[PDB]
Design an enzyme around this catalytic site. Structure first.
Site, PDB file in Angstrom:
ATOM      1  N   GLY H  58      40.722  33.431  41.192  1.00  0.00           N
ATOM      2  CA  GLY H  58      41.275  34.022  40.055  1.00  0.00           C
ATOM      3  C   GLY H  58      41.099  33.079  38.761  1.00  0.00           C
ATOM      4  O   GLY H  58      40.426  32.250  38.578  1.00  0.00           O
ATOM      5  N   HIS H 112      33.204  26.862  44.345  1.00  0.00           N
ATOM      6  CA  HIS H 112      31.980  27.227  43.362  1.00  0.00           C
ATOM      7  C   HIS H 112      32.478  26.728  41.792  1.00  0.00           C
ATOM      8  O   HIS H 112      33.520  26.323  41.696  1.00  0.00           O
ATOM      9  CB  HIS H 112      31.681  28.633  43.332  1.00  0.00           C
ATOM     10  CG  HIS H 112      32.552  29.717  42.865  1.00  0.00           C
ATOM     11  ND1 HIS H 112      32.558  30.909  43.118  1.00  0.00           N
ATOM     12  CD2 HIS H 112      33.709  29.551  42.162  1.00  0.00           C
ATOM     13  CE1 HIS H 112      33.444  31.589  42.301  1.00  0.00           C
ATOM     14  NE2 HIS H 112      34.414  30.630  41.912  1.00  0.00           N
TER      15      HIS H 112
END
Ligand SMILES: *P(=O)(OC(C)C)OC(C)C
Ligand SMILES: *P(=O)(OC(C)C)OC(C)C
Ligand SMILES: *P(=O)(OC(C)C)OC(C)C
Ligand SMILES: *P(=O)(OC(C)C)OC(C)C
Ligand SMILES: *P(=O)(OC(C)C)OC(C)C
Ligand SMILES: *P(=O)(OC(C)C)OC(C)C
Ligand SMILES: *P(=O)(OC(C)C)OC(C)C
Ligand SMILES: *P(=O)(OC(C)C)OC(C)C
Ligand SMILES: *P(=O)(OC(C)C)OC(C)C
Ligand SMILES: *P(=O)(OC(C)C)OC(C)C
Lengths: 180, 180, 180, 180, 180, 180, 180, 180, 180, 180
Positions: H58, H112
């Site tokens: 998020g 990532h």
């Protein structure tokens, strides 16, 4: 919609007395086709007409307009099923002049009972049931005379979607000849 | 949804054996009424029950769930029409215990024939037509019993929407006493 | 809509004094049909006009526009119902020259009362009600004259949807002949 | 909505025999208000009730339910217009106990004729016309009674939207004192 | 959903070992009803349980979860049809302890064959068809056992929607007694 | 969501060490269930837990969270399939303690390969293929150890939707016992 | 779509007996291509025709109409795959006169099994499944003949999307020569 | 979300110093988690806190809020990855007390680079670019410290989605132990 | 779309052997270009052809249809990049006849790896991953030939969007002469 | 768009070597305009061309295509601003032959920096940042050349929207004479 010089391809086929039915039958298609039919008959009441049928079906009434003009005009109308003739498609197909109704090897034909709807008061729902049950009866009698089958066989055989190969349709009596 | 003491105003009226029907009759409403009914009968079986009706109507089967439960339990159920009792609502108003069915002076009652729909194959539309002409008849006959009107007159008077004032509802036999 | 040599198929039939009505009747279709009518009447006030009808019906005032233009012009106007002539469509069928009104064997005609709507104050709804009842009566008289039925039969007959076969439309007096 | 110590502000005011109608009147509000009235009449058939009205109006039948209950229960019901009482609101304001109908200095009162709609066949539009014209007349007669005005003056003054200040409302006979 | 003094109406009925199935059956309803059934059995493995059924039907798996839980537990589970029990609803009505399956006089029951879908490759379509015909055959064999009818009758009677009155339900073996 | 007096029905079942899984498995359901599991184990690390599974399946990761907490806690977790356990449903089912995995007679179990998607650059599509192919492999190994079947059988058998009766699932080794 | 002096580019190419199939195949494309094929054959029954194929594929019936027309006419029809020929596209590429089926070096060809849907009663689902497995089997038998491969290979090679380079197309028997 | 006696299941675990993170991380989840954290730290500054993580990730700033509150508080905070800890989720995993970071055997962690967007003038897009690259570096250093990896490896490793098994996350230094 | 004489401006440029590509490359565009190409080659086989390219890119297969046709016909095709040649557009720019590939001074050229998507079963996603890694490789190798760059460098330089000015496009080997 | 006798108004003006750019500049307009330029340069490499500009601006790459062509063809291109020339419009106005750039007295000229967007990973946002900042700089340098202004003044004056009257445009060096 390619052009032939000036013609669109369909009006060029029209000039050779060929009518192409490639879509669902609604009040527009019916009108174009009844009109092509009337025009051809006025041109040469003597020469025969070729109607290629590939179609999912459609409006019963639109269907009957086409059916009825086929019979009513002078020229004998040949029908060739290509791809699929379903429902009012099969009906038009079986409406070709006897001996002149054709399919190609890989064609399909489907016949079933009419679809409809009713919404409203019980009285209006009854009126619509009544009408649709008569429609189902009027079509079955037409189909029976045209295929050779007894009415009560057509009734049972159209109860649910009934799909036929070109052989099967030949055996059923919906077409005369498979083209090769 | 104001609160009382810790109840909510509809529960407080339930404590008095008062059920309020203020909405269209659907499956939730029927579920809720049927169980308020079952509850009160289990609470005290001999104590009479008050059902206020202001409703546009609704589903016939949910309507009949409420009907049958009214008849099935021991307590006498008295129906007061407030505002509008229409359609399956008029039917429930008329199903209150004889002598116990009331309206207020400006109330409306409306009776008509059943509404529905059918889609699909002629076979399926006929099935639906058949059922709804039955519902219409089963309803008419209960209604004639409740009103004391002859059957053939209920069939005439419900052909289209029929709006009766509280007095006409009285002269018709759907209620007993207009209240003041 | 195919081309015929330069023409479009409907325009080629226009040359032969044939009008095709293939769709619901609205201000657009009426305007084009009346236009075709005035044109054909200026072309040869003397020669007959042929109007093929396959229609679900439509606007009452669009319909009357067509109706009054048919009467108003010198040419006698023959009507052929193919497929369905419903509602204002059936009305236009009946407006063909007496003796010149046709159907094909599988055609349906349907008659009923007008449909409409009102939204507003009691006053505005009243204005609308009085007007739609006036149109009902106007139509009923025009239909009664053209079919040769007594006005009070048209009135019970148009109460709900009334669907007729081609044989039945002939009996009722909406068409003069079924063709072949 | 906040909570007073365990109530919510409105149930709190319900304890003191105050009802707050703050929204448009539809089946839900009618149900909740009629049931607050009955609860309070069951609590003290003697003690007066206070109904504050600020509402745009709403359904005629929901409004009558409330009107009829106000007259039916024993307690005398006092109406106070804060903000605006319009259409069914105005009707409910005028329905408070005579000598008990109030408004605050800046309140508006609006009265007009009923609004409705009708779709369908001529026969259906006529039924709706008659029902709504009977409603108009019934409302008019009740308004005339409780204001002291003549029926024919109520009919003229409700033809289109009639907005009144508190003094004007007072002079018409819709209320009794302007509060301060 | 009213409250009763601190229970909500469905819960207070649950305290009497009554379960209300008032809606369509999906994984949610099933999860709730099954879990109600397990709690009642853990309350009193001896004492009977009553399942009231007014339902349009629903998922076949939600349905069987409920069905199989009814059997798996000790309490004899009695079913009552109020309003309508259709589809998986009918199947549950018929799944009550023999001699304990009831209906009210105006109840309807409807049985039919399973409904579903397949979208995809011919392979996936085949998998999906094979599975639904298995469900069909699994349901029929259970209905035959619970009712008494021969499998071949059930298979023929479920081909299309089959609507039955409570007397017809009773005569077919879906319920044991019509209550009053 | 009925109440037991104060409990909702599920928390009442929770008190008896029963967890109800009635829906698709997503990150919410997984969180509630992992949490019920942790709570029960903290209450009595010694007593066993009952997990009723009825579920279409869902997120693989959510699935593994539930799987992994089942194994990780002290209590042996019993699983009962009711209705359908599909996909991550079957997986949870087969994750019950050996000898403690049950189904009811009419249950279904489905197993298939994982579903997913990739959108983007070839490189990102590769990353996702790789991940999903490892997921498919990680699950198959877990399933194989739990059913007794060789990995390469699980691979072939999950190629396309594979539906099993309770017997079939018993024979496959996904469950130990069919309850009756 | 540019113009060339008065032809549009596709028409001027049609004058050279080249037909371009550049889109998905539906009843419209099929109607157009078939009708192009009948015009060319009526132009010169002797002279060959070239069908260029870049297509995602499409309807199986639109497809067969095209396929069967290619065979039915005299002109030998040569197919060239540019870009991609997939699904019904691949099937048409392979349907060109033997020795006349071409591809450019960077072309792709994809074959797979048919795609479809069924929604409805278990009965309708069965009908629909039976029909798609018939199509599957009819397509496979034609691909086996046109390619040379054994039916059992084709059936195994079409289970999922099978993408092939022009060299692979050539080695499998879908095309005769890779052009430069 | 079930109840435990009064509690909701997550609140009952809150008593035991267990926080559940079950969803994408946004301002709402962060605010509730930080709040739980500050509460537990005020309750027993000394006792350990347990944070279970199943998250897709998020908002970067929501994430840092949680991250900084974990460091900021006296209690050591143990993290358990169950299911998936992706992105900011994986980052929060790594932020658990060194030696106290866990995963279950089937857990995935994924790392990532940050995702974002810019719309506007070149200037505004530049502002946005410089900022997202600054956050990339900030995170990269924080991750490099917590995993014990050299900064330049984290940089090539976070370039595209990097999915790790539980064994693999342990190797990389994101967790201290896999549990059972 | 202005007209010239009666041509339309794009047709007039076609008369000069000028094809303009001003849009994204999809199946219609490829169809239209391929046939403008085929037409010009048939017109005069030895006369060179000019293809202006300003395009964002598009489908790879439609891109390759245009590629292969350029190579396949006799005329040398020279590509002028105007504005932006991106993606499959840069590929076509680079496919012009050696020495004949031009750009204008402010042109951009952009090269990247292929974009696509896969949905469904892991088996199906893998099939799609496989094909797109092939497309990527087939493309890279053609591109290295055309540019004379070593393969491993094309694979590096297309990892992410790579925007080159006209000069860099020149130094790279995608074009020959910048034009003035 | 009207028609002059057989042209349309714009093609008519094209005959007189006038181009009308009246809309926002995107790939379509660019293509049509660049191709009008080339046609006219092919018709008379000597005679001047007139480009009228009233445009809100648009894509940077479509605009450069037009800019680069204007300089590339031999004919000298005269620009006239009617209405407004903004963003890429202003850039195109300033690109007319020196001494040939005009505007009408009430015209506006607006210049500003490029607009763009970037979504995705940090790496992707950075690529977009660099490209758009290279664009800004490239536009700025061309504007500086053709107005005579210093690069650093162009950079400041385009920071936000800069609206200029014709006199101000003239004084900046964007045009040459104000026409009358
Ligand atoms: P179809 O056209 O039926 C429905 C599509 C109305 O023809 C049947 C009656 C054979
Ligand atoms: P209504 O509720 O009818 C339709 C709304 C279904 O009740 C009738 C049967 C009087
Ligand atoms: P129809 O067209 O009626 C409604 C469809 C408006 O014609 C009747 C009035 C004869
Ligand atoms: P309002 O309540 O009117 C509409 C909002 C129905 O009307 C007065 C006559 C009470
Ligand atoms: P119904 O619930 O069927 C469809 C509504 C799924 O019960 C049948 C299948 C016996
Ligand atoms: P399902 O939950 O698969 C998809 C719904 C993701 O479980 C399989 C892997 C057995
Ligand atoms: P495709 O066109 O299949 C689906 C797109 C219908 O050809 C297969 C059926 C051979
Ligand atoms: P993720 O939450 O990144 C995007 C989902 C915003 O965490 C990374 C930056 C480690
Ligand atoms: P682009 O058009 O890539 C995607 C838009 C599919 O061309 C690449 C192969 C350079
Ligand atoms: P405009 O064309 O900016 C946006 C509309 C892309 O910008 C100037 C610098 C030419």
């Amino acid at each position: 919609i390619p052009t032939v010089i000036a013609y669109d391809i369909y009006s060029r086929l029209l000039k050779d007395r060929i009518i192409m039915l490639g879509s669902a039958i609604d009040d527009n298609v019916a009108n174009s086709i009844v009109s092509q039919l009337l025009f051809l008959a006025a041109e040469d009441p003597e020469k025969e007409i070729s109607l290629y049928i590939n179609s999912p079906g459609g409006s019963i009434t639109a269907g009957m307009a086409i059916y009825d003009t086929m019979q009513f005009i002078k020229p004998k109308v040949s029908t060739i099923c290509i791809g699929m003739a379903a429902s009012m498609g099969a009906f038009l197909l079986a409406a070709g002049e006897k001996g002149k109704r054709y399919a190609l090897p890989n064609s399909e034909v489907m016949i079933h009972q009419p679809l409809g709807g009713a919404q409203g008061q019980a009285t209006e729902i009854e009126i619509a049931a009544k009408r649709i049950l008569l429609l189902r009866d009027k079509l079955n009698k037409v189909l029976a005379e045209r295929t050779g089958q007894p009415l009560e066989v057509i009734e049972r055989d159209t109860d649910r979607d009934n799909f036929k190969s070109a052989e099967e349709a030949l055996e059923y009596g919906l077409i005369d000849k498979i083209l090769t």
